[PDB]
Amino acid sequence: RTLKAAILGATGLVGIEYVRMLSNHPYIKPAYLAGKGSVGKPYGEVVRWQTVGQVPKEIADMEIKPTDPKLMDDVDIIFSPLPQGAAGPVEEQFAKEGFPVISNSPDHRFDPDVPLLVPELNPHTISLIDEQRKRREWKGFIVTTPLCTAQGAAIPLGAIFKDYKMDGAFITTIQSLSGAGYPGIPSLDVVDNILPLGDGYDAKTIKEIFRILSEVKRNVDEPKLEDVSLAATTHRIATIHGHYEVLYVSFKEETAAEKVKETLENFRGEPQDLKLPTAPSKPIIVMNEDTRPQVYFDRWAGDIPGMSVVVGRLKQVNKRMIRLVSLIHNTVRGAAGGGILAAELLVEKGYIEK
Template structure:
């Protein structure tokens, strides 16, 4: 039996925060010990939270009081999940790390620092050793580990087995993302009723840059540096609540058989599966052959650990050197809270949480 870890959830009333609360309610060894917020401080969690997810508010947290986001009040806490808004997150997370806390962040503020892991445990597990470097360099007792942008994870999980096994030339991504991806209040209804919200170049580039970093940290089985992969994304929000849906075209430097690609995806596994981590789905990629799937409403909660698997469908051969597929990721689960919990479990196994 593992030692119980006591966790604080920052931004606990947010769209990512509620998924941490939901998923940790039955976790074998991580317990919610502290719920932090900002505007809602002082109120009982169950009264103020917008519970925009499945199931009901767990009884054990409904009456917990929301407390300030202050490391000095968290004596009893072993680790800190930080789904704080961009901008606010950066300094807060550094302060926590300085105070000795292990911080798992879903915010974008530290995603491009070379000594801070941008971790998907199935894809770039070895990057956790950056923690040692980070602590040394920054003289921190604690540390920060980040998870990538939800939409980037929806690309990376299905792309990883392809990139590992084939000589990829270009990746062209078109996204249709859910409104919950911008938090609350987030997307204005006037932007999304009878409309598609164009996210624009900055967002496109953010997505690409994160995919680039994680790909560059992916070990390959093919004799090809992979350095010159072209990546492009065109990003949008549509009127869906949860679930980012993305159409991905991949071209290759040599002929590729789509059945081999399917096999690679189907067999895709990583350390979380090998280690049987509690929040690891047995299949990080669920493949569907149905012509009209994945669909956001019906598939975003797929898998034995709902929302932790990416659902891939529409996989087909475009020409000898090109394939196409659709990927659906639950943005606040695998794309945020679930990814954060999985990262934590992996760090536990590797001794970083002791």
């Protein structure tokens, strides 16, 4: 007994991760590979397989099919890593046609009735679907995952905000190329260079972190999220996968790095308690060596490769300020892997039927 998934944009840098991971999944099958430009061609002939291994045997000869909900009677779930602008209306059209829709796209991320989900952090937000359906009058639904960059920060910051009076986080990112898609970043922009991404990208990263944090169930009540200073300075360099982030985190009062570090080691959420198939044992992995994590060596760490955010370099700066770094696999936990985990949580909660 399995569920049949369609993956929109299946030849893309995110769609390849849905293909790789769903090919190994116990009950979600990659059964319908949707596109536009290469409709009618075999997947393995057209795809850039910029990930680990090779195109799965059983997928390689599948023809890419039209992005058309009228052709998808047989499909149980839509995964939608589509580009911004194009995504919004396609996802509405699928939802209106009665599909569950898991989007990795930005278009719906701040709809107050659409869940911006990190399953370990705000699983309770899925019950927004009730109101979504009723107010939007459709049988289906849309759920979004956040910007991968925002997730590499929000996961550690969420674990901390939960239990500590955190009052700011000032972040520097060093992001990989695959985040921008293909053709994406011109090679001349990152050879012997660093490409700042600009105020617009900095501002959207912070916006998304604020939404995720505004939804975390905390054990302390100070400070109020509105009194939290977040800031980001974002860049891309010539790494293929893996977003590397340096966070300076401030607290309203005296807070020991050793305590925070232990909170990070100990972090887990509903996905781990439920033993969901794509839930890592340790959604945050903490490293103790002063030159770790490194992008190359740590982006595929953990019992489920790519699904863990890897943290290190925990250090006291002064009594109210600590330094840490974090690494997220941007197309796995940051996108496809997070979206598959969303789907398992939604099946588990009753929102997608068996």
